[PDB]
Design a protein around this ligand. Structure first.
Ligand SMILES: NC(=O)c1ccc[n+]([C@@H]2O[C@H](COP(=O)([O-])OP(=O)(O)OC[C@H]3O[C@@H](n4cnc5c(N)ncnc54)[C@H](O)[C@@H]3O)[C@@H](O)[C@H]2O)c1
Ligand SMILES: NC(=O)c1ccc[n+]([C@@H]2O[C@H](COP(=O)([O-])OP(=O)(O)OC[C@H]3O[C@@H](n4cnc5c(N)ncnc54)[C@H](O)[C@@H]3O)[C@@H](O)[C@H]2O)c1
Ligand SMILES: O=C(O)C1=C[C@@H](O)[C@@H](O)[C@H](O)C1
Ligand SMILES: O=C(O)C1=C[C@@H](O)[C@@H](O)[C@H](O)C1
Lengths: 282, 282
């Protein structure tokens, strides 16, 4: 019945649904659970170095942390151990803290997106996929794609250098040329020839209305995924659904990263439907 | 329904009943509550300076802390504000942390012992009392005694200097010569002439069996108190009860310090009977 203490280190955390998911699921399994935002833009933690905040969590009896932007790369050298996937990606979003203070980094963005593919695109054809966007979440998405059956992934970003760096990282991680950086300009023709496409840009959010490419390149035979989870039905996914395409909405990864982290943090088997419920309720 | 995060900074905390009391009462009032030991003898926090640990709690989203030995004096200069009672005593056991990180020190050992007198000795004659022991908890007990109606308190300690320092601190706090240091040797004759006596030494604990003075000096008309709370019925209180004396057991202060701190930490009205229940159940 031991209480569970967790937090999230990052910037601009007020709207995160991750604390609620973990607090509700802990309680549902008979464990009082606190999950605190540790926001370096906020009044409590501003100006503090990542190492200070990590060490604080160790001293205070935290059982785990999530890590978000801008710290998912910076955190790695601070940890005692890092999983092979998080090591090869160079990004950790989950830190398990042992009873006595030892830290292990994991990446449940990767495992969560992969689980979302299994759950929401079980029959998808994976030979050729395009991903638009190579930022933060895009790196984990790309790794997930090519580890969950994608043979060739073409990644486009306005910043070609980001796409090519992504490709190098993932290809090294997997040990094959799974990923190719391609130009953003003319990406429609590349998507048209592919089996599926994933949006890993901010486009579709209320503050970034529209789509990252012209949806007229889609066909009924494509599948389409999106990382954006608010709104759940982005303009891109609306356009795909209108053609009869299978779609993967961004809530799947957002929920499953938390499912997977909860399991790592606690050793308990999370109830996916309960955590999904909490996510959707906020 | 916001979750509550609390801890205790001190040494040798495994057997504290304070975390359980606060966790259970938070939950009973519909708030998931974590209360962590922050033990500088343990694996998480050893070697860290008090200031490091206090700052950690601020950064991490703690709502409050208790402070125990050896830090109840050292903590004062680290806090933004300290209550008048804790300031004059020179000892803080409770730190309220505001939403945005500001700290206020309080002393609920003082308020808790006083409440115990009201609750368990409502009819006690208070003109002349003896206290044996001037350590850590003894300072708070002495302040409580003379602020809850004791006219003259005689404090004995094997270390006369500790008793006289206590007397100076309390007398300054109250603004009268309420307390006098007296020799431990011959304390029985002093107790015999007094209305009541309080044990503030370790005597009566399993590892300190016996009594701090010869109980043959007690009469049926005395009242007797004890700070020791395990066992609840110390040899001293057994001897008092055998004569028909009213007695004050150490659980009252131990419970009420937590009642009072919970109120300060949360702004909720604690249920005393529930917290007492939790205490006794451990
Ligand atoms: N599902 C989830 O769990 C989850 C979690 C966090 C964030 N997100 C979403 O992921 C989005 C991306 O997050 P991020 O932190 O990687 O953002 P980021 O800004 O670091 O990366 C976005 C990338 O998209 C590129 N881009 C923008 N428009 C483009 C276009 N038209 N064509 C090609 N590239 C384009 C940018 O150059 C940038 O490199 C966020 O806006 C958020 O909506 C989802
Ligand atoms: N009720 C409660 O909430 C509560 C909380 C914490 C501790 N305690 C109890 O309080 C006891 C005292 O705690 P402390 O931290 O102040 O201990 P301490 O060791 O700092 O102080 C005890 C004092 O008793 C004196 N002493 C010992 N035997 C004596 C004797 N025969 N005559 C005169 N003086 C004597 C010592 O010289 C010392 O100064 C603990 O052992 C514990 O059982 C009670
Ligand atoms: O702040 C959020 O909502 C989160 C964002 C992602 O970085 C996740 O990986 C993190 O665990 C939770
Ligand atoms: O560790 C304990 O059991 C405690 C001891 C006293 O110092 C109290 O004042 C503190 O709040 C809790």
């Amino acid at each position: 019945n031991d209480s569970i203490l967790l937090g999230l280190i990052g910037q601009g955390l007020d709207l995160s649904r991750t604390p609620a998911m973990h607090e509700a699921e802990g309680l549902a399994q008979g464990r009082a659970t606190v999950y605190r935002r540790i926001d370096t833009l906020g009044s409590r933690a501003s100006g503090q170095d990542l190492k200070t905040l990590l060490d604080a969590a160790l001293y205070l009896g935290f059982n785990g942390l999530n890590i978000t932007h801008p710290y998912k790369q910076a955190v790695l050298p601070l940890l005692d151990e890092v999983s092979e996937q998080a090591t090869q990606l160079g990004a950790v979003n989950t830190v398990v803290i042992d009873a006595t203070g030892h830290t292990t980094g994991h990446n449940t963005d990767v495992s969560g997106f992969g689980r979302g593919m299994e759950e929401g695109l079980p029959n998808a054809k994976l030979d050729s996929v395009v991903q638009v966007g190579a930022g933060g979440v895009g790196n984990a998405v790309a790794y997930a794609l090519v580890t969950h059956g994608v043979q060739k992934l073409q990644v486009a970003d306005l910043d070609t250098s980001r796409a090519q760096a992504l490709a190098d990282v993932i290809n090294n991680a997997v040990g094959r040329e799974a990923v190719v950086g391609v130009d953003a300009r003319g990406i429609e023709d590349v998507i048209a020839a592919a089996d599926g496409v994933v949006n890993a840009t901010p486009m579709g959010m209320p503050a970034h209305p529209g789509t990252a490419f012209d949806v007229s390149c889609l066909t009924k035979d494509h599948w389409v995924g999106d990382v954006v989870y608010m709104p759940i039905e982005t303009e891109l996914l609306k356009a795909a659904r209108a053609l009869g395409c299978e779609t993967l909405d961004g809530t799947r990864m957002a929920i499953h990263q938390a499912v997977d982290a909860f399991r790592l943090f606690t050793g308990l088997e999370p109830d996916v439907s309960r955590m999904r419920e909490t996510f959707l309720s906020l």
